Amino acid sequence: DIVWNNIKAEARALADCEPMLASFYHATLLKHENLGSALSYMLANKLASPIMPAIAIREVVEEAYAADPEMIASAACDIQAVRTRDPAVDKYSTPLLYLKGFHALQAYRIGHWLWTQGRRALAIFLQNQVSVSFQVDIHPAAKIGRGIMLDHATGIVVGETAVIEDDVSILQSVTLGGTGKTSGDRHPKIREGVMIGAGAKILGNIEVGRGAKIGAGSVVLQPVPPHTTAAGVPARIVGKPESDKPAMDMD
Template structure:
């Protein structure tokens, strides 16, 4: 956590010096806080306050983060991973303050903590506020890993019994849903390093294997083997996944 917090503070200070018009913004959104956890709680509260009327969100969110240290460590992993793999993200500060995928996933983490504690009503309220704010709907019972890359995110839907492991990439318009023919555990399991491209739909209690790629607008109804590429409606294997993707290994020159 220490290195990320240092990066964020340095970048906020650089922003305020480079553009004095934004000095107060950089201060009020980051430099005024003593820790990453406090800044995270305040940032999420600020984004969601319009949905929550007069609820004192910042203090509530900070208490959840303090009680569940894994939330902050997973948030840090998300930010670090996004800054590494996304050529459209110039730095950690931009990821933290502006990327809706980062923000919506952290709101999910808060809701998930409430859900696991048995506070289902509060968890679903927070889910609804986040969906209305970012157009990303993640059920609080779903299980998400860390170092996630949620690119754009608009229209992303993740169902109740879905599992998304570490370093998974999810583009806008992705649905991890059910077929309506299964009860109980009825949503997909997305294994480490898999990539689900824009508009893809994965339905049912099926597995998308580690490092597999689901092409844009595909409809996946059957398990996908690790390190394969599937495409089409219904999705079929079209090849092997490359060992690396150019988008993930080369930052653009700003």
């Protein structure tokens, strides 16, 4: 509710800032009563393709938001996460309009909901369109929570059996990928509060304890305990982070 009024606020100012984009700001933000509508609009535009047009995607997204409204809530926490944690982002509207990490994340939620409902064929279709379109490959069966930030995002991979809990922050090229040719648990369970830096690779079914910090470039083959800074290739513990939840700080 409060986040949505700032978006609308910022939008009125931007509409005056840049005439070329007035109608854009009006179409994406100002014409909607609430965030859920701005989200279906944005997802429809960003996922649209000849095979499924915006208008048809929007029907699907609205279905999912009608059926599990906490998605909209999740996304509002995802907006707040970016605004504080990204010093490049000074506005509640920037993620919603412009940031592929945020878009991919919300597109994941739709495919997740679809997969919950056993609508696998669609979930997979979208998963892969999102890869091509936003350069983020998240399997719909992954369990991701609220207040997440995929900053820059180009190159993120997250596989079938992964979990990401609330208040996590991830960067470009991070892979929460698997090992083996065999189905079953083989993807990381990343716990509440973790930061992962650019170009980490975290493979197999391994915990990353509640509050840990995976350094940039790190390749993490073994479990990593809470409140620990892992790093190196492959990853040994070089540290303990400077805050309880290093996701909020981005050291």
